[PDB]
Design a protein around this ligand. Structure first.
Ligand SMILES: [Mg+2]
Ligand SMILES: [Zn+2]
Ligand SMILES: [Zn+2]
Lengths: 98, 1358, 50, 79, 49
RNA sequence: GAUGUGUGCU
DNA sequence: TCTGAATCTCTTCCAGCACACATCAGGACGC
DNA sequence: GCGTCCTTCGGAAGAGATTCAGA
């Protein structure tokens, strides 16, 4: 199986999972500690934003890759905004300071 | 953008500010033309447009009308992705209590209103009343009234006083309460009171009040007035095949809440009867509780077929929530997955990507170059060209895949070597060829496992893969400095068959002119590969300052070793291939090649070694037949001896010599001894069975048997597995851990019985159940080790400290398990070590001592080097490079900005997981020891006995009556060379300070049945032991002898629980004898399950056995049974019977007698003497009325709790204790872990420090605040004339030390999300995004590696 | 037709595969002898005897 | 034409600042029109950047001073 | 498990004192359980469902 | 999308 | 008869990745 | 066929609530 930029999930804008569906392999929690141990911070950042939950940077990176330029402009993962909204749906107020 | 994340309670005004509307109808999409309802859970007016830039009614359809609000249906035209950013709200008819602040312990409402949880729970659910504003009557402000009491108070006190039930009354209580007045009243009461429980409760309530008053939170905000709703795009309704809709849980809960709210609102307008409206309010409360956190109340409501639907908390907490499933680990694009094959033609920096997989991974990269070269003009033309797979696409793929490394990751990524970067080599196929050297690192065989490919996109990612994650730069394990790309199981067989000799050849006496001549003779067939010839070899040496000086000689070698010498790089001595190379030998060869030459020669050497191992293993035909498993001719004689011994054991047991718990142990011991004797016999029959002529008469040599070859070479096998083929299989182990009573007396070359196979199946199923059912509690260990040490990185270069722990070789029962070199290699020392040419320094203070310095230290034979440790570092928020040591993955000091706390956690956490997933490779063998009974000193020297309280024997010898004694052997020089732990009640054939010949017994004892031997003589009286009550007694009337077994706490009666059975030694005249030197009578207690073969009132001698205690210590002793101990050490669990230590030094004496438990008073010579300790009657005391003790000395005996050690013997003692215990547990299994990682974990366990006195600082009296903040405040105050604050270090387990951190995001994402978020919301905490998990969750660069410089720039920018 | 790895046999004690290999070798040897006796048409007596 | 970058790490002894320096140089060589200082052998920009690092004639100081010089030259060309 | 009465043990880890309790479960093929069990103070407590 | 079952490698 | 010690009771945790299949989604009653 | 609707059962550990006992 292989997967480039394809179909993404609905609630959290992440790539789908599976082979029947065109889905990307899960870079799980235990695989993130492996990139933290090396000190690979740009690789991890592109792993969890640029080809993941982040939406605008995901398309900007695709255009850059088919533009001759291998550079990322990451934003914020969508699943973190989902987490903030789900906390705010309780009686809890969570927000990002300035 | 942002720099902090603040969490707090949400006021109803703020909830209304969030909301863009008010959902007031329980109607989703109408199961029709897919449009939202009027004001339901989905609404274009409230939340947002369903379609992008299109009005719902059909009036505005384009971007030319952007921003306007329609009039027909009132929905503003905007981007449709605003349906996941605009929340709503529900105006509840009645107030409703938040379940998180009610049923999470401790209840915030409970200890804010000072009421028990039961009373407020009955008030909220309309089962009792609460007296608000009691007034001029006999009712208090928090009294609980039932229905009858409420009616009575209404009939006889029908004044303006009112008492309500439900959440409205609780909200009135919270709003009508003053916080500052209550806080000062509580402070007054706390200062007045003296009981510790009342003090703790009052200070907990004071802390809650201070957290409420300091933050902007209010008590009345914990009762919900308006309930916000999640945006619809975060709870979507996906239409299935047909007219139905998906079963959403949040929508169902919202519909229930809206139904209840609308029903209550309707009933509030028609003036319904009181019981009906109260029941409806209770139903609304239950619906809101089920929406917020379903299942925390009595019964979780279920949607369909009895399964509880997930609430707003079940999708934020747990393993399947937005924290561990979508934020700490995500699915990624540019990724692939396929099985793996060998492809041994590769190099260490190469892998094989299938030609049809790299085209789909590097697809945008192919698009870019196709548009650049002009073969396409748009993106669709290039997309179709790639889809068609034209002849020009493959050349573009070759051009874009040239130097673009990809990441190969196997499914369990235990350590950091599970992700590595390879330069792809396009192959035709569908399997990812993986280099055979990295299979050990991946722990990946080729029996059907798959690996995932990941494509680094950016230039920074490609350079991180090429410079950090490259498989070329991963030749050393990060846990220990041993090489990790080690040839395994075929290259070692090739190099062992090559570098070997037999005493004959095609040509043996010939003398050659070089290795090329040897290769030419082997290839031409004129000389065997195992000749013994003399080759002329020019070896180089860099003994100078990097100059290779040749030294040509004529050495007695073989042809195979000479052929192998052609690949050894220049600079290495010839005395590394001139031997029979196994796996350890060539692992050492690669290690010394890396330590001498560098990285590039080591990688080229590894590739050449793999090639020449595969070639010469192919050229040998090292098969395996059925005649290669040679059965020894004397196995059944050893079987007969052991079965006769077992028959004698049975006859002794049935007579009554031993019980049923000792027959088990002795039969296990005798069968394990017989199994080892059979294994030794078959190994001796295998290893040397090669009688071959020397060209004259017969001669002996090491065997060429294939089984023995691949067992001795270390290729694949050991003594156990090979023993089970030709010796005897032995005895199995059950899943519970118990060893099977009966052994199997057949091997896997003969058959097995229909019954022996059934017996073996117990161990076989144990081995397979252990992995799949108990690697969970070892993956849990590494997860909560990572989550406690994630935020530890190297932030400095040198803190400038002279402190540090002491390093000595560990000899704790045998020979040198780890010499000083292994424990001190690559760690910066703390003081100038003094050789035994004393008053002269050997090494400087701050030198990172490498292999040359270790050789220098071992030359002078040093025994103790004070080395700098992580736990003793003085840096704040991180460690320095010198206090950590060597990277252990490269041969230099650790770089600034390296996540060492994650490398430490992985290194500790995955020998356990890996070895508990590999427990079945030995099948189900018991793998237990033989229960060694005697001490045979092998070396020559004197003896030194430590902490011994011994007395005389009836034969005059010495008998040990001390628990923690150690028999250590000191040679003629004065250094310790051997050490042994002798047990209680063990006789001594020799004493202290006398030279012992090498190879004779010194201490003998029984491995089981520990005695209770005395020290004085006289008659013994059966004190406090009567038949039936405290002892089970059975009498042989023929002999008239009684053998009573004192029962344990289980079968002993409740009335006789305070009865303590013991043996008072008495003289002839009824007087109590005295322990020599003391005045305490010789009273000796007897624990449970103890048998006594003596009668009441029998004369004894000094130092003889009065009673026996069986040990029943039976276990398979794998890494599965043996790793709850590491979890206990890291979680700092107090043992059952803690050893009593001395809190304060001074003279020890007793005062008052029998306060239920004994009283001991310690009085120093100069200072204050306020200390008294309550010692229970359980354990005796090793100190007496007139001795001198120091803090940390043991008043009693038992396992030391790792908190008394911290608070008495200091930080160094507790960290050394934890390191030694964990290292012993791991070393029992052969695991090799450097102690830097355990020291890092201990340091992460040591971050809290309770204040003792406030001083001039701003801290409180007994607050638990982080030690780094205390050190910063004290160092800042001591700069001025102010006095600092005295503290006390605390030790928390890896769970508590991670759940009690300053960042609520890490704690919430680790465990107990509801409990962490509730406390964070109440206290109004503000996260600073300081760790690694926080930046991973947020979506930034970790402040660990290449992002460390960027984070330093950002931090110093503001 | 197939070349396996010897070292898979000692580590995991599946010695039954080696005995199966030897017994299959014997079976195919018997089949080869029958095929040799049958390829050149011999009388039924020799086939029955073998 | 690159396998191991140990020599480049010896040139810039951090192995973490080396990644940033090589990334900056490769970005200058890929997006910007700056030609490589060493003869390219059909290698990608990252490999050429690493080769310039390990050949000695580039580092963070050299890149910063050259960037400042070219920026001041552009400033002088403003007229 | 077949329907009937089974006298289990609950041996050991209960009450943290080593005292082995004793319980009897009456499992029907269809119906409610009738669990009897012992107390650490030697009392007989029935427990339905 | 979630459940339920089976399965592969650790 | 007040306050530590013990016991009782409630709570939260129990590895990773992947593949295949089916089934659900209101089903009762009014129309 | 359209369509509005309103069981019980593991197991170790930890915290916080009772409850004992003992001076
Ligand atoms: Mg495998
Ligand atoms: Zn409209
Ligand atoms: Zn330091």
């Amino acid at each position: 199986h292989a997967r480039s930029t394809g179909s993404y999930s609905l609630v959290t804008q992440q790539p789908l999972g599976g082979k029947a569906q065109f889905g990307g392999q899960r870079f799980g929690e235990m695989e993130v500690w492996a990139l933290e141990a090396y000190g690979a911070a740009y690789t991890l950042q592109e792993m969890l934003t640029v080809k993941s939950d982040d939406v605008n940077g995901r398309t900007k990176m695709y255009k850059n890759i088919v533009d001759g330029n291998h550079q990322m402009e990451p934003g914020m993962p969508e699943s973190f905004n989902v987490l903030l909204k789900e906390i705010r749906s309780l009686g809890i107020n969570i927000e990002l300071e300035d | 953008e942002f720099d902090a994340i603040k969490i707090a309670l949400a006021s109803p005004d703020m909830i209304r500010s969030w909301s863009f509307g008010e959902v007031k109808k329980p109607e989703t999409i109408n199961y029709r033309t897919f449009k939202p309802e009027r004001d339901g859970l989905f609404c274009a007016r409230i939340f947002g447009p369903v379609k992008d830039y299109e009005c719902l009614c059909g009036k505005y359809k384009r971007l030319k009308h952007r921003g306007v609000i329609c009039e027909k249906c009132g929905v503003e035209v905007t981007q449709t992705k605003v349906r996941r950013e605009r929340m709503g709200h529900i105006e509840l008819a009645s107030p409703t209590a938040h379940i998180w602040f009610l049923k999470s312990l401790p209840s915030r409402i409970g200890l804010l209103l000072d009421m028990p949880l039961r009373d407020i729970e009955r008030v909220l659910y309309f089962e009792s009343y609460v007296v608000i504003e009691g007034g001029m009557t006999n009712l208090e402000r928090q009294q609980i009234l039932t229905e009858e009491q409420y009616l009575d108070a209404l009939e006889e006190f029908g004044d303006e006083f009112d008492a309500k039930m439900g959440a409205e009354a609780i909200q009135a209580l919270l709003k009508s309460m003053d916080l500052e007045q209550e806080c000062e009243q509580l402070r007054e009461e706390l200062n007045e009171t003296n009981s510790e429980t009342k003090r703790k409760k009052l200070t907990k309530r004071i802390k809650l009040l201070e957290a409420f008053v300091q933050s902007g939170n209010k008590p009345e905000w914990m009762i919900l007035t308006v309930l916000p709703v999640l945006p619809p795009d975060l709870r979507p309704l996906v239409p299935l095949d047909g007219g139905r809709f998906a079963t959403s849980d949040l929508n169902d809960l919202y519909r229930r809440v809206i139904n209840r709210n609308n029903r209550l609102k309707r009933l509030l307008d028609l003036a319904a009867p009181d019981i009906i409206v109260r029941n409806e309010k209770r139903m609304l409360q239950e619906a809101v509780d089920a929406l917020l956190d379903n299942g925390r109340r009595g019964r979780a409501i279920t949607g369909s077929n009895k399964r509880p639907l997930k609430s707003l908390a079940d999708m934020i907490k747990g393993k399947q929530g937005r924290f561990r499933q979508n934020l700490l680990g995500k699915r990624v694009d540019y990724s692939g997955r396929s099985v793996i094959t060998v492809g041994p033609y590769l190099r260490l920096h190469q892998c094989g990507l299938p030609k049809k997989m790299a085209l789909e991974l590097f697809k945008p990269f192919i698009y870019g170059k196709l548009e650049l070269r002009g073969l396409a003009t748009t993106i669709k033309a290039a997309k179709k060209m790639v889809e068609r797979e034209e002849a020009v696409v493959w050349d573009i793929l070759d051009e874009v895949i040239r130097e673009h490394p990809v990441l190969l990751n196997r499914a369990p990524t235990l350590h950091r070597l599970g992700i590595q970067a390879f330069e792809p080599v396009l192959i035709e196929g569908k399997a990812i060829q993986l280099h055979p050297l990295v299979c050990a690192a991946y722990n990946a065989d080729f029996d059907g496992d798959q690996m995932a490919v990941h494509v680094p996109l950016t230039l920074e990612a490609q350079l991180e893969a090429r410079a950090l994650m490259m498989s070329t730069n991963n030749i050393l394990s990060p846990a220990n400095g041993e090489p990790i790309i080690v040839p395994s199981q075929d290259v070692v067989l090739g190099l062992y068959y090559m570098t070997r000799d037999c005493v004959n050849a095609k040509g043996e006496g010939m003398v050659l002119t070089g290795p090329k001549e040897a290769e030419r003779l082997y290839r031409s067939g004129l000389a065997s590969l195992h000749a013994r010839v003399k080759v002329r070899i020019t070896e180089y040496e860099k003994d100078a300052n990097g100059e290779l000086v040749a030294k040509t000689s004529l050495k007695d070698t073989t042809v195979g070793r000479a052929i192998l010498w052609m690949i050894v790089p220049k600079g290495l001595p010839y005395s590394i291939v001139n031997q029979a190379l196994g796996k350890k030998a060539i692992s050492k060869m690669l290690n010394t090649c890396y330590r001498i030459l560098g990285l590039k020669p080591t990688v080229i050497f590894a590739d050449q070694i793999m090639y020449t191992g595969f070639a010469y293993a192919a050229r040998s035909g090292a098969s395996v037949g059925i005649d290669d498993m040679v059965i020894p001719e004397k196995k059944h004689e050893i079987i007969s001896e052991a079965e006769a011994e077992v028959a004698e054991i049975q006859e002794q047991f049935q007579s009554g010599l031993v019980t049923a718990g000792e027959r088990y142990n002795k039969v296990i011991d005798i069968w394990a001894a017989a199994n080892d004797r059979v294994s030794k016999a078959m190994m001796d029959n295998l290893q040397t069975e090669t009688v071959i002529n020397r060209d004259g008469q017969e001669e002996k040599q090491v065997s060429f048997n294939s089984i023995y070859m691949m067992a001795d070479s270390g290729a694949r096998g050991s003594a156990a597995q090979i023993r089970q083929l030709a010796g005897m299989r032995g005895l199995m182990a059950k899943p519970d851990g118990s060893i099977i009573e009966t052994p199997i007396t057949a091997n896997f070359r003969e058959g097995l019985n229909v019954l022996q196979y059934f017996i073996s199946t117990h161990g076989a199923r144990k081995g397979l159940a252990d992995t799949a059912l108990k690697t969970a509690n070892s993956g849990y260990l590494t997860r909560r080790l990572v989550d406690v040490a994630q935020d530890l990185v190297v932030t400095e270069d040198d803190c400038g400290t002279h402190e540090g722990i002491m390093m000595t070789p560990v000899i704790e029962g045998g020979d040198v398990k780890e010499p000083l070199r292994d424990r001190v290699l690559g760690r910066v020392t703390a003081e100038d070590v003094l050789k035994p040419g004393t008053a002269d320094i050997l090494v400087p203070r701050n030198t990172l001592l490498h292999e040359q310095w270790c050789d220098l230290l071992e030359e002078n034979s040093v025994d103790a080097v004070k080395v700098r440790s992580v736990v003793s570092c003085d840096t704040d928020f991180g460690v320095c490079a010198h206090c950590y040591g060597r990277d252990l993955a490269r041969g230099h000091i650790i770089n600034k900005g390296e996540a060492i706390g994650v490398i430490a956690a992985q290194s500790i956490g995955e020998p356990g997981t890996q070895l508990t997933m590999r427990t079945f490779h030995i099948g189900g063998a018991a793998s237990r020891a033989a229960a060694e009974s005697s001490i045979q000193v092998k070396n020559k020297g004197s003896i030194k006995l430590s902490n011994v309280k011994s007395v005389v024997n009836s034969s005059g010898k010495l008998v040990i009556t001390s628990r923690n004694t150690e028999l250590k052997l000191i040679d003629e020089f004065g250094r310790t060379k051997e050490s042994y732990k002798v047990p209680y009640g063990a006789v001594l054939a020799k004493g202290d300070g006398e030279q012992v010949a090498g190879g004779e017994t010194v201490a003998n004892w029984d491995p089981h049945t520990m005695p209770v031997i005395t020290e004085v003589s006289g008659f013994v009286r059966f004190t406090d032991m009567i038949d039936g009550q405290t002892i089970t007694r059975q009498t042989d009337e023929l002999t008239g002898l009684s053998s009573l077994v004192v029962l344990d706490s289980a079968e002993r009666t409740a009335g006789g629980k305070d009865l303590r059975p013991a043996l008072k030694i008495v003289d002839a005249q009824g007087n109590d004898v005295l322990i020599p030197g003391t005045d305490m009578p010789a009273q000796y207690f007897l624990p449970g399950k103890a048998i006594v073969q003596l009668e009441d009132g029998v004369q004894i001698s000094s130092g003889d056995t009065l009673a026996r205690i069986p040990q029943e210590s039976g276990g398979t002793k794998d890494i599965t049974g043996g790793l709850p101990r590491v979890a206990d050490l890291f979680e700092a669990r107090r043992p059952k019977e803690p050893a009593i230590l001395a809190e304060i030094s001074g003279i020890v004496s007793f005062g008052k007698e029998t306060k239920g438990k004994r009283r001991l008073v310690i009085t120093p010579v100069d200072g204050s003497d306020p200390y008294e300790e309550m010692i229970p009657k359980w354990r005796q005391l090793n100190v007496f009325e007139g001795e001198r003790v120091e803090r940390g000395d043991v008043i009693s005996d038992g396992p030391e709790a790792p908190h008394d050690i911290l608070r008495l013997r200091g930080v160094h003692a507790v960290t050394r204790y934890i390191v030694n215990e964990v290292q012993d547990v791991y070393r029992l299994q052969g695991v090799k872990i450097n102690d830097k990682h355990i020291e890092v974990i201990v340091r992460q366990m040591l971050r809290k420090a309770t204040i003792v006195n406030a001083g001039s600082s701003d801290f409180l009296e007994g607050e638990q605040v982080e030690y780094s903040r205390v050190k910063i405040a004290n160092r800042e105050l001591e700069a001025n004339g102010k006095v600092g604050a005295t503290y006390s270090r605390d030790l928390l387990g890896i769970t508590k030390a991670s759940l009690a951190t300053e960042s609520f995001i890490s704690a919430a994402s680790f465990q107990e999300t509801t409990r962490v978020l509730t406390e964070a919301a109440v206290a109004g905490k503000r996260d600073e995004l300081r760790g690694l998990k926080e930046n991973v969750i947020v979506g930034r660069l970790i402040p660990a590696g290449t992002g460390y410089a960027y984070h330093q720039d950002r931090m110093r920018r503001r | 037709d197939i070349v396996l790895n010897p070292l898979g046999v000692p580590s995991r004690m599946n010695i039954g595969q080696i005995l199966e290999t030897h017994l299959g070798m014997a079976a195919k040897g018997i089949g080869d002898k029958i095929n040799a006796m049958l390829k050149q048409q011999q009388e039924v007596a020799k086939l029955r005897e073998f | 034409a690159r396998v191991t970058v140990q020599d480049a790490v010896e040139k810039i002894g951090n192995r973490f600042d080396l990644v940033l320096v090589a990334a900056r140089r490769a970005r200058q060589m890929q997006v910007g029109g700056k030609d490589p200082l060493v003869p390219e052998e059909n290698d990608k920009t990252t490999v050429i950047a690493l080769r310039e690092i390990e050949e000695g004639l580039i580092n963070n100081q050299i890149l910063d001073v050259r960037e400042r010089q070219e920026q001041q030259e552009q400033e002088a060309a403003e007229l | 498990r077949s329907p009937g009465v089974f006298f289990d043990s609950d041996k050991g880890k209960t009450h943290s004192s080593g005292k082995v309790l004793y319980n009897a479960r009456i499992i029907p093929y269809r119906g409610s359980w009738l669990d009897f069990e012992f107390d650490p103070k030697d009392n007989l407590f029935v427990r339905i469902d």
